[PDB]
Scaffold this motif. Structure first.
Motif, short mmCIF file in Angstrom:
data_model
loop_
_atom_site.label_atom_id
_atom_site.label_comp_id
_atom_site.label_asym_id
_atom_site.label_seq_id
_atom_site.Cartn_x
_atom_site.Cartn_y
_atom_site.Cartn_z
N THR A 147 -0.75 -8.50 8.23
CA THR A 147 -0.61 -7.10 7.88
C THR A 147 0.59 -6.54 8.62
O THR A 147 0.66 -6.62 9.85
CB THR A 147 -1.86 -6.30 8.22
OG1 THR A 147 -3.00 -6.92 7.61
CG2 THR A 147 -1.73 -4.88 7.70
N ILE A 148 1.53 -5.97 7.88
CA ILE A 148 2.69 -5.29 8.45
C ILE A 148 2.48 -3.81 8.21
O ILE A 148 2.57 -3.34 7.08
CB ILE A 148 3.99 -5.79 7.82
CG1 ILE A 148 4.06 -7.31 7.92
CG2 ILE A 148 5.18 -5.15 8.52
CD1 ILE A 148 5.13 -7.93 7.06
N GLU A 149 2.17 -3.08 9.28
CA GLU A 149 1.82 -1.67 9.13
C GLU A 149 3.05 -0.82 8.84
O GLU A 149 2.99 0.11 8.03
CB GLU A 149 1.10 -1.16 10.37
CG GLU A 149 -0.25 -1.82 10.64
CD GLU A 149 -0.14 -3.05 11.53
OE1 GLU A 149 0.97 -3.35 11.99
OE2 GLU A 149 -1.18 -3.70 11.77
N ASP A 150 4.16 -1.12 9.50
CA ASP A 150 5.39 -0.35 9.35
C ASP A 150 6.40 -1.07 8.48
O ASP A 150 7.60 -1.04 8.80
CB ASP A 150 5.99 -0.03 10.72
CG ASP A 150 4.99 0.61 11.66
OD1 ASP A 150 4.43 1.67 11.30
OD2 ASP A 150 4.76 0.06 12.75
N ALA A 151 5.95 -1.73 7.42
CA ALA A 151 6.85 -2.39 6.48
C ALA A 151 7.77 -1.38 5.81
O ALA A 151 8.92 -1.67 5.49
CB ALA A 151 6.05 -3.17 5.44
N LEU A 207 1.90 -3.46 4.24
CA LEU A 207 1.99 -4.63 3.39
C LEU A 207 0.99 -5.67 3.89
O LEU A 207 1.12 -6.18 5.01
CB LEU A 207 3.41 -5.18 3.40
CG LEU A 207 3.78 -6.35 2.51
CD1 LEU A 207 5.08 -6.05 1.82
CD2 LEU A 207 3.92 -7.60 3.35
N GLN A 208 -0.02 -5.95 3.07
CA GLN A 208 -1.14 -6.80 3.45
C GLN A 208 -1.09 -8.08 2.65
O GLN A 208 -0.78 -8.06 1.46
CB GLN A 208 -2.47 -6.08 3.20
CG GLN A 208 -2.61 -4.76 3.92
CD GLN A 208 -3.72 -3.91 3.34
OE1 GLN A 208 -4.29 -4.24 2.31
NE2 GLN A 208 -4.03 -2.82 4.02
N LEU A 209 -1.40 -9.20 3.29
CA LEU A 209 -1.41 -10.49 2.62
C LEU A 209 -2.80 -11.10 2.74
O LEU A 209 -3.25 -11.42 3.85
CB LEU A 209 -0.36 -11.41 3.22
CG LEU A 209 -0.39 -12.88 2.82
CD1 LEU A 209 -0.08 -13.04 1.35
CD2 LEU A 209 0.61 -13.64 3.66
N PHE A 210 -3.47 -11.27 1.60
CA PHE A 210 -4.84 -11.77 1.56
C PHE A 210 -4.83 -13.25 1.25
O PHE A 210 -3.94 -13.74 0.55
CB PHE A 210 -5.68 -11.05 0.52
CG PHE A 210 -5.87 -9.59 0.78
CD1 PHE A 210 -4.95 -8.67 0.32
CD2 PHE A 210 -6.96 -9.14 1.48
CE1 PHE A 210 -5.12 -7.34 0.56
CE2 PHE A 210 -7.13 -7.80 1.72
CZ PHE A 210 -6.21 -6.90 1.26
N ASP A 211 -5.83 -13.97 1.76
CA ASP A 211 -6.02 -15.38 1.46
C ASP A 211 -7.33 -15.55 0.72
O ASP A 211 -8.34 -14.94 1.08
CB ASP A 211 -6.02 -16.22 2.74
CG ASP A 211 -6.20 -17.69 2.45
OD1 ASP A 211 -5.32 -18.28 1.79
OD2 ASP A 211 -7.22 -18.27 2.87
N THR A 234 0.81 -1.20 0.00
CA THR A 234 0.00 0.00 0.00
C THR A 234 0.85 1.26 0.00
O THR A 234 2.00 1.27 0.44
CB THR A 234 -0.92 0.03 1.22
OG1 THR A 234 -0.17 0.48 2.36
CG2 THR A 234 -1.46 -1.35 1.50
N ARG A 235 0.23 2.36 -0.43
CA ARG A 235 0.90 3.66 -0.46
C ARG A 235 1.28 4.12 0.95
O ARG A 235 2.20 4.93 1.12
CB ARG A 235 -0.03 4.68 -1.13
CG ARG A 235 0.52 6.08 -1.28
CD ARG A 235 -0.57 7.05 -1.64
NE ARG A 235 -0.12 8.43 -1.52
CZ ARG A 235 -0.91 9.49 -1.63
NH1 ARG A 235 -2.21 9.36 -1.87
NH2 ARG A 235 -0.39 10.71 -1.49
N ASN A 236 0.61 3.60 1.97
CA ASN A 236 0.95 3.98 3.34
C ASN A 236 2.23 3.31 3.81
O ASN A 236 2.74 3.64 4.89
CB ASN A 236 -0.20 3.64 4.28
CG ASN A 236 -1.56 3.89 3.66
OD1 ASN A 236 -1.91 5.03 3.35
ND2 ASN A 236 -2.32 2.82 3.46
N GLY A 237 2.76 2.37 3.04
CA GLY A 237 3.93 1.64 3.48
C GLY A 237 3.53 0.31 4.06
O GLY A 237 4.38 -0.55 4.31
#
Lengths: 42, 849, 160
Positions: free
Chosen positions: B456-460, B443-447, B438-441
């Motif tokens: 979800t890694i918010e501060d990736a 990183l989301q992983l969907f199943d 995401t543009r926020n930085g």
RNA sequence: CGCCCGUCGCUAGUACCGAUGAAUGGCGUCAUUUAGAGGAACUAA
RNA sequence: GGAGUAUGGUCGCAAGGCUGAAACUUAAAGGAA
């Protein structure tokens, strides 16, 4: 006396003596006179 | 021999850039425009009943080189089951809905169709376009009956009932009533200052919205024969929205006979207003009269107040429909005594159905209720990235606010996930997991199976994750971001406290001096290419992170990087309209291609080959041969700039997602591409025709005189007029006059010389017939004199030798009429000369010393 | 505010005047078309109205009678505009007939004294006079050439 | 003697489409401006 | 010695190309036109 260019900006005057206005002219006619004046300027 | 690529599908668009026409049920069905094609949607099921497509798929051999014209207006006639579609080039197509074929094709407009309207009979179709013309088309003969061309700008709206009168409002701020009997504008008024966007006519009431908040109310009195009485300005009232209003439309309840209309706005609001009944308006007038009597104002002042408030008497603000998105079009779908129902197709690719419950005075509910919505099979915001799964059976499109997984074969949406501003997406191996950046930085992983986010890694990253790639096994991830770092993540499965859940853990980081836009890992996992905002791309060995080469020569940043299967060739495509093909053995540049007129967003090699697709802001997808560095095929199906491109692992198909909310598939096909008369003769023939007609008419008149004098026998028949004279609508005098005017001054003497004497006599007869007409003789007096005097001088001896009493009488008449006209002009000139000399003499005498 | 409303009223009145002139010239009404043409300053419309009014005048009144009465009505600034138009048309040989006819109408229906103290009039008059003299010479020569028909009739009569 | 014609390009102006967005204001939200562009039109030269 | 030529000797300085632009016939700008 010699017919020259009209003093009013809207008015178009020709050497023929025929005077014609940009308000009364149609758009196709304005295109036609613009191209004719282009060839005369050429 | 190179295989052809042709478009095999187009999905993802519900309604785009044209008005929607409602088709009643046998909440009904809604017909919407889907770019080059037309969709029919069933509202209650939310399913596409049918799709109307123009012809051959784009990218085919016989397809035109330019982009297809999008559908810009729709208008359906229910009695004949017809639908008129007005495209952006000017083409009007008439589809019968049952057979789904183009019955009639009209091309009369140089610009996009703005409004179409059938007549009641269904035999004429009236079309207003951007080129400031209104054209009426006869569907019976497939021709254009007439064209209406006094407008200086595009026709925003019009209204035509009957075959006599029309009313049109344009963007030049001006409204015109049109007489269709003479095809000419009778009355022309200035409606609003800048633009006149919306027009709607109901009986004797006419409502126009312009560029401002104010709306104008007009009375239409067609039968008023006085000039200026056809349209009158009663009053103004103010709608709340400051935006201008495109579309006004009335509708009447069948039972109560009340009328409600709506004003669309550019904003999210649609204002529905109600007209009060005649008895209610009279009661309000009586109440205002009582109020004015209580106030004690003067009757003239009360009249002025009544004239001011008369706009408020007819109309009252009923309600306002608000939606989450900007509205493109709307329609009054049905009216009952309990509810008013409205359909609206929005800007961001949705269809919404709204209902308003009411009790004849005020609506019962504070806000209108959104009953049905068709927003499932589409994207709200433009697709930033796509990915085809490893099995090539699934597609994943990621955009701002939603990640949707589509089935490619059945062309619909299997699953929908909520997410943030998604810049890049990818598939994990096996097609089970989708990874997002995401543009926020974040990183989301969907199943796909659990239908929810796993990790979800918010501060990736501190800044936007611009690009993302996996290794071949998928165990390792390389994320390149705008925080000037590239971070390596590792996927490992941890047993739950007991099912294994994948988790991404941060291993290593490479901090570069500037922003990283794109990151690509080579298929054999040996190379890692990293774009930069320094207009350079680095190449690292993936093992040991040893810096191999820095490829430079791009003026603007490299937006896409792609590596061939044998890892001998790399392609960088940048915003300076260049695709540069480099060899990875040493870093030399084999080729630089000036490909598009705007930036190349994405480049993808085909599997097992060195050919590659290019995807740009020119809305062109270009297929390229990297063997001889030449463009093979040019694909033009996209309307606006195209963001993402993906290629199947088999190479059979290439999917493109663009700004126009449309996702397209380009599939390989079985076919393969390989990389006169002289002047004077016209005078004689004109003299023959004209003098024959004149002599026949004179003989016929003499026969009528003799038969009327005798009062016995059969009456003579009038001779038929000559076909040329009837077709040109000219009397023979004017016809021969026009031939003389067409003859030039240099050729004139030779023409008059070359005519023989019989034609000289016919010329004299023609001259006498002209003398009988006083207007034409005075209009062409010097020409007639010059021609006649030359003819007489040239043929004087033969003419004298002729002994004809009729010829003598003709010469006498011609002489008398010539001298009369010439001395009349002479008297005018002499009188004016002496008068003007007297005026100058008097002025000189007054202002002389 | 009020000045902007006055400008909008002027623009609307201009639009209505143009549409009314177009309707008039569509359906005839040469006096109304002439008046609107002089107010709107459209020389082509003015010349077409005058020449076609002379057209039905060919079939004492110079033009249609109410058109002549309108030309008598016209004030001095419209007189200056019309005489400039007539001077320019008089420079041409084809269009000099309408110019002579209109100048004669002005002279018959106006006051010569006020025509003299109209400022700038005598420059226009001095421009008009030599072209009228050239046209008079040409038409007089045509009348002279017209006697070839008398000569032909004399010889035909003595023959038969 | 009394206006050779048409298409395209070029230039200026006005309004529209939707992305980057940015800035600001009012209560993250909403509203108003503005910029990089592009897209497609009409008038004026 | 004054003034000035010649020099297939030595030494040094040269001269040449539309620029960006090369390993790329490659962008926006210009430079000319």
């Amino acid at each position: 006396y010699n017919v020259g260019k009209a003093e009013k900006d809207g008015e178009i005057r020709l050497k023929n003596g025929v005077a014609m206005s940009k308000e009364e002219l149609t758009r196709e006619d304005k295109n036609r006179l613009r191209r004719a004046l282009k060839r005369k300027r050429s | 021999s190179y295989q052809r690529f042709e478009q095999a599908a187009a999905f993802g668009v519900i309604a785009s850039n044209a008005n929607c026409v409602w088709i009643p049920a046998s909440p009904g069905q809604l017909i919407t425009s889907a770019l080059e094609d037309v969709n029919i949607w069933d509202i209650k099921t939310g399913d596409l009943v049918s799709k109307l497509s123009d012809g051959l798929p784009p990218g085919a051999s016989d397809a035109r080189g330019a982009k297809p014209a999008e559908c810009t207006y729709l208008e359906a006639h229910k009695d004949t089951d017809l639908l008129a579609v007005g495209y952006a080039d000017g083409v009007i197509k008439v589809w019968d809905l049952m057979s789904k074929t183009v019955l009639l094709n009209f091309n009369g407009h140089k610009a996009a169709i703005t409004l179409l309207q059938f007549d009641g009979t269904g035999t004429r179709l009236i079309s207003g376009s951007k080129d400031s013309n209104i054209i009426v088309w006869d569907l019976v003969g497939e021709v254009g009956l007439y064209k209406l061309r006094s407008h200086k700008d595009s026709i925003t709206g019009f209204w035509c009932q009957g075959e006599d009168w029309l009313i049109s409002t344009s963007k030049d701020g001006m409204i015109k009533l049109w007489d269709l009997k003479t095809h000419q504008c009778i009355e022309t008024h200035i409606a609003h200052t800048g633009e006149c966007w919306g027009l709607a006519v109901k009986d004797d009431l006419l409502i126009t919205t312009g560029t401002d908040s104010q709306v104008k109310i007009w009375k239409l009195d067609i039968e008023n024969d006085k000039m200026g009485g056809k349209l009158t300005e009663m009053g103004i009232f103010e709608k709340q929205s400051k935006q201008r209003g495109l579309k006004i439309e009335f509708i009447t309840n069948s039972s109560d006979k009340t009328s409600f209309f709506y004003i669309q706005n550019a904003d999210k609001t649609i204002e529905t207003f109600r007209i009060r009944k005649e008895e209610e308006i009279a009661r309000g007038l009586k109440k205002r009269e009582k109020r004015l009597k209580e106030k004690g104002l003067t009757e003239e002042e009360i009249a002025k107040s009544i004239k001011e408030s008369y706009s408020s008497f007819i109309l009252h603000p009923f309600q306002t429909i608000r939606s989450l998105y900007k509205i493109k079009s709307a329609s009054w779908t049905t009216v009952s005594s309990s509810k008013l129902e409205l359909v609206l197709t929005t800007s961001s690719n949705t269809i919404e159905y709204y209902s308003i419950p009411y009790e004849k005075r005020d609506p019962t509910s504070p806000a209108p209720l959104k009953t049905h919505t068709i927003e499932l099979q589409g994207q709200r915001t433009d697709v930033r990235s796509i990915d085809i799964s490893d099995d090539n059976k699934l597609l994943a499109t990621a955009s701002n606010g939603s990640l949707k997984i589509w089935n490619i074969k059945t062309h619909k949406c299997i699953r929908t996930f909520e997410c943030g501003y998604a810049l890049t997406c990818k598939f994990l191996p096996g097609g089970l997991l989708v990874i997002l950046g995401t543009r926020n930085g974040e990183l989301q992983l969907f199943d796909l199976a659990s239908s929810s986010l796993l990790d979800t890694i918010e501060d990736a990253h501190d800044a936007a994750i611009w690009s993302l790639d996996l290794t071949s096994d998928g165990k390792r991830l390389v994320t390149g971001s705008a925080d000037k770092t590239v971070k390596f993540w590792d996927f490992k499965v941890e047993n739950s406290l007991f099912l294994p859940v994948l988790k991404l853990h941060h291993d290593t980081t490479l901090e570069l001096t500037d922003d990283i836009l794109c990151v690509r890992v080579s298929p054999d996992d040996r190379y890692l290419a990293i774009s930069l905002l320094d207009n350079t791309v680095k190449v690292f060995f993936l093992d040991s992170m040893k810096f191999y080469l820095s490829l430079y020569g791009h003026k603007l940043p490299v937006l896409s990087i792609d590596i061939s299967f044998d890892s001998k060739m790399i392609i960088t495509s940048s915003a300076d309209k260049n695709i540069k093909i480099w060899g990875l053995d040493f870093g030399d540049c084999h080729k630089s291609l000036f490909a598009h007129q705007d930036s190349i967003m994405n480049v993808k090699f085909l599997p097992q080959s060195h050919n590659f697709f290019s995807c740009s802001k020119d809305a062109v997808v270009k297929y390229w041969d990297g063997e001889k560095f030449e463009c093979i095929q040019k694909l033009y199906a996209h309307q606006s700039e195209v963001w993402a491109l993906a290629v199947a692992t088999d190479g059979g198909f290439v999917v493109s997602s663009s700004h126009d909310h449309s996702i397209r598939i380009w599939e390989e096909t079985e076919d393969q591409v390989f990389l006169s008369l002289k002047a004077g003769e016209r005078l004689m023939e004109a003299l023959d025709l004209g003098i024959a007609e004149i002599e026949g008419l004179e003989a016929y008149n003499r026969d009528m005189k003799l038969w009327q004098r005798k009062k016995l026998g059969e009456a003579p028949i009038k001779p038929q007029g000559n076909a040329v004279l009837i077709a040109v609508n000219k009397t023979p005098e004017q016809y021969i006059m026009d031939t003389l005017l067409r003859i030039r001054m240099s050729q004139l003497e030779d023409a008059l010389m070359v005519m023989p004497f019989s034609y000289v006599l016919k010329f004299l007869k023609f001259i006498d017939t002209v003398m009988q007409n006083k207007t034409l003789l005075h209009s062409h007096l010097p020409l007639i004199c010059k021609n006649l005097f030359f003819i007489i001088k040239f043929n004087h001896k033969e003419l004298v030798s002729q002994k004809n009493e009729e010829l003598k009488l003709q010469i006498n008449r011609v002489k008398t009429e010539l001298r009369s006209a010439l001395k009349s002009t002479e008297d005018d000139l002499g009188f004016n000369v002496q008068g003007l000399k007297f005026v100058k003499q008097q002025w000189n005498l007054r202002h002389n010393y | 505010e009020q000045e902007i409303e006055e400008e909008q009223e002027k623009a609307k009145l201009q639009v209505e005047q143009e549409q009314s002139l177009q309707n008039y010239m569509s359906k005839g009404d040469w006096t109304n078309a002439f008046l609107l043409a002089m107010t709107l300053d459209h020389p082509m419309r003015l010349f077409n109205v005058l020449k076609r009014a002379l057209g039905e005048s060919r079939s004492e009144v110079i033009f249609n009678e109410e058109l002549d009465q309108a030309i008598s009505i016209l004030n001095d600034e419209q007189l200056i505009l019309l005489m400039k138009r007539c001077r320019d048309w008089n420079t041409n040989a084809k269009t000099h007939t309408i110019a002579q006819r209109t100048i004669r109408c002005i002279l018959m229906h106006h006051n010569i004294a006020k025509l003299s103290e109209i400022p700038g009039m005598v420059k226009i008059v001095d421009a008009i006079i030599p072209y009228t003299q050239r046209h008079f010479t040409r038409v007089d020569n045509l009348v002279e050439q017209s006697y070839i028909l008398d000569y032909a009739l004399v010889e035909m009569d003595k023959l038969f």
